[PDB]
Design an enzyme around this catalytic site. Structure first.
Site, PDB file in Angstrom:
ATOM      1  N   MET C  13       0.814  -1.214   0.000  1.00 40.41           N
ATOM      2  CA  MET C  13       0.000   0.000   0.000  1.00 40.41           C
ATOM      3  C   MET C  13       0.850   1.266   0.000  1.00 40.41           C
ATOM      4  O   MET C  13       0.600   2.185  -0.774  1.00 40.41           O
ATOM      5  CB  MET C  13      -0.938   0.028   1.211  1.00 40.41           C
ATOM      6  CG  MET C  13      -1.994  -1.057   1.213  1.00 40.41           C
ATOM      7  SD  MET C  13      -3.248  -0.718   2.455  1.00 40.41           S
ATOM      8  CE  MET C  13      -4.346   0.384   1.502  1.00 40.41           C
ATOM      9  N   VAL C  14       1.849   1.315   0.872  1.00 38.26           N
ATOM     10  CA  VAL C  14       2.730   2.481   0.949  1.00 38.26           C
ATOM     11  C   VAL C  14       3.500   2.592  -0.360  1.00 38.26           C
ATOM     12  O   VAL C  14       3.646   3.684  -0.927  1.00 38.26           O
ATOM     13  CB  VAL C  14       3.705   2.356   2.129  1.00 38.26           C
ATOM     14  CG1 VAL C  14       4.727   3.501   2.105  1.00 38.26           C
ATOM     15  CG2 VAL C  14       2.913   2.372   3.432  1.00 38.26           C
ATOM     16  N   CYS C 149       4.280   5.366  11.467  1.00 39.47           N
ATOM     17  CA  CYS C 149       3.220   6.221  10.951  1.00 39.47           C
ATOM     18  C   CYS C 149       2.409   6.917  12.037  1.00 39.47           C
ATOM     19  O   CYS C 149       2.046   8.081  11.884  1.00 39.47           O
ATOM     20  CB  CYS C 149       2.286   5.428  10.011  1.00 39.47           C
ATOM     21  SG  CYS C 149       1.499   3.965  10.736  1.00 39.47           S
ATOM     22  N   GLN C 176      -6.182   3.294  15.215  1.00 36.05           N
ATOM     23  CA  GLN C 176      -5.545   3.141  13.924  1.00 36.05           C
ATOM     24  C   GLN C 176      -6.319   2.321  12.911  1.00 36.05           C
ATOM     25  O   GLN C 176      -6.837   1.245  13.212  1.00 36.05           O
ATOM     26  CB  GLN C 176      -4.137   2.569  14.139  1.00 36.05           C
ATOM     27  CG  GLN C 176      -3.412   3.301  15.263  1.00 36.05           C
ATOM     28  CD  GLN C 176      -2.018   2.785  15.586  1.00 36.05           C
ATOM     29  OE1 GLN C 176      -1.477   3.107  16.638  1.00 36.05           O
ATOM     30  NE2 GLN C 176      -1.431   2.005  14.688  1.00 36.05           N
ATOM     31  N   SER C 179      -5.759  -0.283   7.257  1.00 36.01           N
ATOM     32  CA  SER C 179      -4.682  -0.207   6.268  1.00 36.01           C
ATOM     33  C   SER C 179      -3.295  -0.146   6.902  1.00 36.01           C
ATOM     34  O   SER C 179      -2.302  -0.512   6.274  1.00 36.01           O
ATOM     35  CB  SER C 179      -4.872   1.008   5.350  1.00 36.01           C
ATOM     36  OG  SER C 179      -4.823   2.231   6.067  1.00 36.01           O
ATOM     37  N   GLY C 180      -3.230   0.337   8.140  1.00 40.20           N
ATOM     38  CA  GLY C 180      -1.960   0.408   8.841  1.00 40.20           C
ATOM     39  C   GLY C 180      -1.304  -0.961   8.939  1.00 40.20           C
ATOM     40  O   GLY C 180      -0.109  -1.077   9.209  1.00 40.20           O
ATOM     41  N   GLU C 202       3.282  -1.483  18.913  1.00 43.63           N
ATOM     42  CA  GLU C 202       2.904  -0.124  18.543  1.00 43.63           C
ATOM     43  C   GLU C 202       3.105   0.918  19.641  1.00 43.63           C
ATOM     44  O   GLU C 202       3.672   1.978  19.400  1.00 43.63           O
ATOM     45  CB  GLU C 202       1.440  -0.092  18.101  1.00 43.63           C
ATOM     46  CG  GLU C 202       1.042   1.181  17.372  1.00 43.63           C
ATOM     47  CD  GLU C 202       1.683   1.275  16.001  1.00 43.63           C
ATOM     48  OE1 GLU C 202       2.487   0.383  15.649  1.00 43.63           O
ATOM     49  OE2 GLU C 202       1.386   2.239  15.268  1.00 43.63           O
ATOM     50  N   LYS C 205       6.859   1.750  20.333  1.00 43.10           N
ATOM     51  CA  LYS C 205       7.443   2.526  19.245  1.00 43.10           C
ATOM     52  C   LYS C 205       7.065   4.005  19.313  1.00 43.10           C
ATOM     53  O   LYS C 205       7.906   4.869  19.099  1.00 43.10           O
ATOM     54  CB  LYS C 205       6.997   1.984  17.887  1.00 43.10           C
ATOM     55  CG  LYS C 205       7.610   0.660  17.498  1.00 43.10           C
ATOM     56  CD  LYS C 205       6.877   0.069  16.311  1.00 43.10           C
ATOM     57  CE  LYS C 205       7.409  -1.306  15.977  1.00 43.10           C
ATOM     58  NZ  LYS C 205       6.547  -1.974  14.968  1.00 43.10           N
ATOM     59  N   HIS C 242      -5.302   7.519  10.983  1.00 40.57           N
ATOM     60  CA  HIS C 242      -5.022   7.183  12.374  1.00 40.57           C
ATOM     61  C   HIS C 242      -5.436   8.349  13.246  1.00 40.57           C
ATOM     62  O   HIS C 242      -5.053   9.495  13.004  1.00 40.57           O
ATOM     63  CB  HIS C 242      -3.536   6.890  12.581  1.00 40.57           C
ATOM     64  CG  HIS C 242      -3.093   5.594  11.985  1.00 40.57           C
ATOM     65  ND1 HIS C 242      -3.977   4.695  11.429  1.00 40.57           N
ATOM     66  CD2 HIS C 242      -1.869   5.025  11.893  1.00 40.57           C
ATOM     67  CE1 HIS C 242      -3.315   3.626  11.023  1.00 40.57           C
ATOM     68  NE2 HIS C 242      -2.034   3.801  11.294  1.00 40.57           N
TER      69      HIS C 242
END
Lengths: 349, 349, 348, 349
Positions: C13-14, C149, C176, C179-180, C202, C205, C242
């Site tokens: 996706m990215v 992200c 979130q 798609s993440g 998550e 981070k 998000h």
């Protein structure tokens, strides 16, 4: 270009906002008046509408004052466009036409009136000839033109170029309609999410009947209804935009599958020939991939003015196909605006 | 209350977990062994399954150790039930049958084999008689019984009690299948939410073909396929559980709606008569409200074994009705277990 | 002056997002696209499952997929990486060990002391570390990193408020989008009509990365910002976008209007030099009490701007809700913006 | 069983249908009358309600004729239960109470009135004592008891057993509430599907303030509000049933993480002690799995009367925990019924 001044009835709903957005940037159609409910009259469009479209409200329309649905407020307008709800359109539109206004509406009232053209540009622009005898027939000083039910509009696209097969058969149709088709707030989250409602009040009868007029033939200043024996089942699905339709033409007539695909992909009409601003280059798109069309992929085809057909197949005694279209554009906003473009092109203005 | 010992292949998938939840409390069917992937063999069920059913795992199955899909691990069971994936079922199942096991499975392989009964209890229990000559015909020591595709199973319900009219007509079916139909993780959220995929690999062919066998007539040790000329369109919808079907029987035969509704609502068979544990009192439920059936309202009818029909209507040359059934139960788990119950009842034990 | 670049993981996706953005870029020219081994040799259009809007840019559809190995990126100026976290380390290190300039949004090396973790408007100055990276790591090449992200989105509002966010406890809840986790990371059954209050790693981070993103560059290195924040990450049935609820515990008087003013007037290097991917106004503030909303604001300024709303201050707590496009601001966009900043400052 | 005859105001809404469902099968609480809007009065419940609960209308209520909300139609009930919408509750309830009726409402009006008990059974059944002085203080002949905002009810479950710590800290809460919280048709599909609305009019204030009273102490016949410095943010998510909550207790106090878990899962109160019918055996369920609680997995815990807590963590200056509850049962229907049960048990009748 020389601008044609237009007004818009029921400019607050979903179809209304779509039209406002499409007109805000139109070459010659100049939107100078928008109408909404009584309590909003006098306020600026931006202060009365709950914008639901993409982006911000066009500056060319945000400050437009809200006017009433009465004749006096539309005297200087060249053409009155209408997106009024079905239950309010009859009286309002009738009074305007009686006062001499030219009205083009996508609301249901009058759609099946024998003296009123039901237009889907590519399909039956010729039917506009009915306008030559309307005033004398209804005794109106004005002009009234109608656009069909969004689903009907979408379904008629593939049927027209195949009218000779469809006429000699039993047409079975299942339509899967997006939630937006009931407006922005018509359906609750609890009622439809992760669910299916196999019923949409009055939709099935409107589809079958209207399809009969859309595919009809003009003869001696009147429309001879096409012989279409169709049975339809309309279902509501948890989709935002896009009406899907599974069409089964049950018949023993010979059928050249490849010629059909060719006929649909090459289908062009007057709107394409005169390159009208709102006319898509290819009103019908044919997909070869077996898992198409799909709302999230094809709904926006050519700004939502093109319908996408797929799974075209010929089995015993039946020609099947799946069609998809943007119910807000092809099914309402875009065809009304396209209808006006055609009228200007033909001189009815 | 003598317990009949059974084993379950593919006990970790949705269909498998459903059967486990159903067998846990069965009156006489005792689940004593379960199978799953090889790397899971030896571990207790609770430690190898990603349980997605309702509530905690039944305490009478949670500690069951996972065994292999090979004969040696099932020599001690009376009946081998199978919910294995279509792609792995054939080889596994055949060997168990070749080594003398009695295997009742809902996987696709062998479904259309002339010597293998394709059962949906209320519809064709009589077909179990095919087993009287299976061994000699196939050269097996064991016995194999099959259950049809979940959608076919659901569609066949209303078609059976109306077989006379269905045989003399072109059958047009459009199906709306839940996501669960593709397993718990077969379809991503991005691919289906707010969307529609007008295609499901091989689904349409199976539905058409299997309906032929399910409605067939056992005549002198052979199944005479029912003359059912049907064209089906299978569509994936953003629904969790429940497959919907829109059935149009296009014929010139007389159509009496009140009669048909009576026929459908009073439909019963051996399962009902004998009051088998997994048999619904009323296999077919009929609804008079126009917005029925709906997945979130009707998919649980009688623990998911009864199907719901509504919108029964008669139009020119066509009988139309909407049917809905739980694809995990009526379409798989429930009919496999019910089949074993009938087998016990008829003596095939 | 054209700058030739390649893209690792151009199929996700990215990756597709970056492909769409680069296909029409002013000076960045995408000359090579890479993907998994079995895809190498196939034309992009045949290897990718296009999932973006519109068609595949015609300047990329016929590009043949290349490997992730050095030999295929020799003639490239800068190597951009959108590789999955589990495969990036080995792949990128080798490229850098061969003298390649690599800018990636994958997690490995994000917290490495000698590698800048850049979010354009927030800490472009941290790019200086690069002047010492080669000797400190003993590499021929260069490596730059973009944050998680969600961290990228949460950092936007925190920066201009760094003084108060520093002397206070920070509570953050993030919602979130699906798609993440990629296009096919989460199944319909697992998330529809549901909420999963957990996203592996998550929360750690975001806390740690926010620390470096808001750090001060002092004496050839980054001084982590004293951001004491506890975060809880939640997955919701949303496609893109998000969301974050940020609570900063103040012990003073706060003027809400000046907060709004401070946020909307926030600008930085990317804006100063009007770089192609820099948004005119990185932080948009909404006065309506029901904003921001994913379906309404996620696309703000091509997804490079974040939207804040519900700015409130009571019970000695500054509360605000922020929304960002996890695919552009969260990754694709900042990776491209980062390269632009690099070219702007002379690192090229 | 010693019967208690009750009536239900707002029997038609979601919460009301929930109560109707729970009262039909109740051991001693006899639902003898049901009320709804004026235009429905005189009709049978089955003919006035748009049933949305699972299954059919209990036959013990289907034929009950809808009565008014005025005193004359409740002179014969022992207790009046009320699930009326916040905007209509005040006047209707005050009049009943002023006429001597005992009313137990889950509507917001009077919730924060110092002379009126705000009850969530386990947390503060003790506050019912306020009733011994309510008549002298309000002049009323009747009796009024209130139940808190559903989200506040759920959130207060884990905060109570940890009140000593919550009081010496700053509580930061983010709540994610289900669509059903706004009624069956409160929110449209278009407005919430695939989306998030970071706002729910007045929810945040209610939670913080009500949390204060729910956790208060009874002293000298009054309630000493608990010193709870809370800062809540309420968000609307596209889920059907179940409110989730992220509770952060910011404190430097020493905390034994296993003691907290132990304290929560072992929490029991009078409702449990007395084994009341609508009281769950375990009011709070603690989960060890990192991805719990989850609406689709845990919302039904113990018939929706138990809240599920998970992700209990103590990082440094913060005690973090995630909680989930059924907004329709624990948050409304179940507590109102449970409250009546407590009253009967303690002699308030």
């Amino acid at each position: 270009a020389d601008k044609i001044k237009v007004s818009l009835l029921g400019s607050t709903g979903m179809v209304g906002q779509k039209m406002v957005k499409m007109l805000a940037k139109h070459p010659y159609l100049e939107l100078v008046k928008v109408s909404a409910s009584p309590s909003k009259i006098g306020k600026k469009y931006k202060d009365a509408v709950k914008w639901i479209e993409q982006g911000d409200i066009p500056e060319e329309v945000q400050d437009l004052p809200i006017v009433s649905t009465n004749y006096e407020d539309h005297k200087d307008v060249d053409v009155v466009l209408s997106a009024l709800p079905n239950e309010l359109a009859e009286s309002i539109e009738l009074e305007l036409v009686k006062n001499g206004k030219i009205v083009v509406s996508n609301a249901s009232p009058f759609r099946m009136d024998p003296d009123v053209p039901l237009i889907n540009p590519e399909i039956n622009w010729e039917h506009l000839e009915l306008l030559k005898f309307q005033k004398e027939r209804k005794g109106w000083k004005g002009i009234l033109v109608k656009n069909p039910n969004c689903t009907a509009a979408i379904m008629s696209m593939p049927i027209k170029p195949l009218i000779e097969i469809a006429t000699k058969s039993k047409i079975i149709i299942t339509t899967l309609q997006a939630v937006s088709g009931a407006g922005y707030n018509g359906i609750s989250f609890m009622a439809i999410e992760g669910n299916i409602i196999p019923y949409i009040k009055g939709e099935e009868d409107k589809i079958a009947k209207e399809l009969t007029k859309l595919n009809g033939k003009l003869e001696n200043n009147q429309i001879i209804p096409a012989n279409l024996d169709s049975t339809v089942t309309s279902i509501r699905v948890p989709t935002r935009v896009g009406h899907m339709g599974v069409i089964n033409i049950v018949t023993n007539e010979r059928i050249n599958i490849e010629e059909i695909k060719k006929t649909l992909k090459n289908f062009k009409s007057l709107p394409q020939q005169k390159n009208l601003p709102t006319a898509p280059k290819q009103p019908i798109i044919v997909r070869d991939e077996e898992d198409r069309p799909q709302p999230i992929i094809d709904v926006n085809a050519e700004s939502g003015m093109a319908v996408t057909v797929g799974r075209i197949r010929h089995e015993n005694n039946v020609l099947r196909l799946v069609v998809l279209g943007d119910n807000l554009v092809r099914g309402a906003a875009g065809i009304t605006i396209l209808t006006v473009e055609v009228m200007k092109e033909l001189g009815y203005i």
